[PDB]
Paper text:
The Papain-like protease (PLpro) is a domain of a multi-functional, non-structural protein 3 of coronaviruses. PLpro cleaves viral polyproteins and posttranslational conjugates with poly-ubiquitin and protective ISG15, composed of two ubiquitin-like (UBL) domains. PolyUb and ISG15 have common other structural features: ISG15 comprises two Ub-like (UBL) domains and mimics a head-to-tail linked di-ubiquitin (Ub2). While K48-linked Ub2 (K48-Ub2) and ISG15 are similar both in sequence and fold, the topologies of how the two domains are linked are distinct.
Residue numbers in the entry:
A (entry chain A): 3 to 314
B (entry chain B): 1 to 157
């Protein structure tokens, strides 16, 4: 005696299967998952009729479907994705006017900060899996997006994390081709040098949190011994990310999009999210606090941008 | 729809690889790696017989290549040592001798030793792309005197 189930890799192309109830799922499909739960070594229950199961791509059809969705051939992916999801569906996702954080659990503060950030910057993902999940995360059903973020970044539930590392890994899977940055580095021995950057490098800088400082110049050490001045000549992107080692920084309302606060060291630490709505919000996981002004250890600051040319 | 491509080698001998429409050069090289065990970065690919080079991020279906088309693979095993720079949080570029065949992991070992930091408390980037431990240096297209950035890893829970 048998039941009817669906096997898939994308939850788009569903394949009708008839399962012998005497054998494990594993004995018929190889590695098999029900909403992230590993049901490989489990015999089919009656309550499984008509339900969808994810499986390891194990034929040239499933392989095509899977790459078209995830943009990876990596055989471990559904393993690490489904393993993450199995935890992320059990987290709570509190909102403030549609902005979705995560109640603290399994050291998830960095994920929560990343998740909040992603909802406030104009970003277009390439793997349909990320784009689909990204649109459902903005709507409030965000557990799936978090599991994909963990998998793509190759981190696990429980592991400590860095928000800048995470955005760096994700930005590789985003279309940033239209993004362009032009800098001038002004030494006294090299002279003046103008470099044009594209993609990820056009939107991330590590050295200062201030966008207004980067526009009128920052001191960096040069190859030629002493100190050159780097400044921003032209910028064409929907946002910019400005990062620097955690430092006591004042965030003025209306002068930035959102920012990451880091309290701790290079062993253990904790992230809070600060965003500029009608006033300044401080979102520590589930807890929300409003203030007209904010000072604290900021490490990452996101700004809104369209097209900037300098006057120098 | 999936589709099959013919890879002609300069040894003369052919084989077949399975693609999907959204696949570009990276995945072809990764599929060739599968069948003949040659690092992606050591493969030069061009349309056969026209002999025009492949566009690096636009899909293969978008370019000339469709089902029944052929591509020429030639293999540059050249593994000469080269000098690369690895800059820390301060700004001090230090020079390391490496080969494009040795893993990012092996490079972190060297940088961990010289900068005196546990290998798992920093990550490396080249041109904004994170370097993954298990992959070889060649994948990230490092030239002689290319500058790898060392990033101190925050540990947020
Ligand atoms: Zn100089």
């Amino acid at each position: 005696r048998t039941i009817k189930v669906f096997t898939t890799v994308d939850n788009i192309n569903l394949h009708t299967q008839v399962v012998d109830m005497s054998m494990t799922y594993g004995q018929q499909f190889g590695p098999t998952y029900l909403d992230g739960a590993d049901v490989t070594k489990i015999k089919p229950h009656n309550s499984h009729e008509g339900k969808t199961f994810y499986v390891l791509p194990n034929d040239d059809t499933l392989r095509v479907e899977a790459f078209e969705y995830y943009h990876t051939t990596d055989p471990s992916f559904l393993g690490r994705y489904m393993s993450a999801l199995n935890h992320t569906k059990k987290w709570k996702y509190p909102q403030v006017n549609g902005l979705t954080s995560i109640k603290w659990a399994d050291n998830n503060s960095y994920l929560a900060t990343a998740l909040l950030t992603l909802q406030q910057i104009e970003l277009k993902f390439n793997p349909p899996a990320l784009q689909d999940a990204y649109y459902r995360a903005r709507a409030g059903e965000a557990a799936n997006f978090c599991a994909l973020i963990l998998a793509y970044c190759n981190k696990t539930v429980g592991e400590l994390g860095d928000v800048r590392e995470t955005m760096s890994y994700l930005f590789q899977h985003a279309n940033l081709d239209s993004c362009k940055r032009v800098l001038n580095v002004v030494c006294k021995t090299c002279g003046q040098q103008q470099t044009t950057l594209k993609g990820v490098e056009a939107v991330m800088y590590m050295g200062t949190l201030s966008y207004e400082q980067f526009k009128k110049g920052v001191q960096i050490p040069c190859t030629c011994g002493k100190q050159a001045t780097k400044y921003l000549v032209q910028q064409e992107s929907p946002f910019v990310m400005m990062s620097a080692p955690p430092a006591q920084y004042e965030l003025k309302h209306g002068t930035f999009t959102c920012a990451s606060e880091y309290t701790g060291n290079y062993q253990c630490g904790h992230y809070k999210h600060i965003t500029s709505k009608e006033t300044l919000y401080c979102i520590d996981g589930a807890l929300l606090t409003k203030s007209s002004e904010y000072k604290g250890p900021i490490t990452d600051v996101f700004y809104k941008e369209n097209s900037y040319t300098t006057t120098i | 729809a999936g589709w099959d491509l013919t890879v002609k080698m300069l040894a003369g001998n052919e084989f077949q690889v399975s693609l999907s429409s959204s696949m570009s050069v990276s995945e072809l090289k990764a599929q060739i790696t599968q069948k003949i065990g040659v690092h992606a970065f050591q493969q030069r690919l061009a349309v056969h017989p026209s002999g025009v080079a492949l566009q690096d991020r636009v899909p293969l279906a978008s370019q000339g290549l469709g089902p029944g088309s052929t591509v020429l693979l030639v293999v540059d095993k050249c593994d000469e040592p080269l000098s690369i720079l690895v800059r820390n949080n301060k700004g001090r570029s230090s020079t390391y001798e490496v080969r494009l065949t040795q893993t990012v992991a092996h490079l972190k070992q060297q940088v961990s030793g010289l900068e005196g930091v546990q290998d798992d408390l920093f990550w490396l980037t080249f041109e904004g792309k994170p370097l993954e431990d298990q992959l070889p240096l060649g994948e990230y297209g490092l030239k002689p005197l290319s500058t790898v950035f060392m990033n101190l890893r925050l540990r947020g829970g």
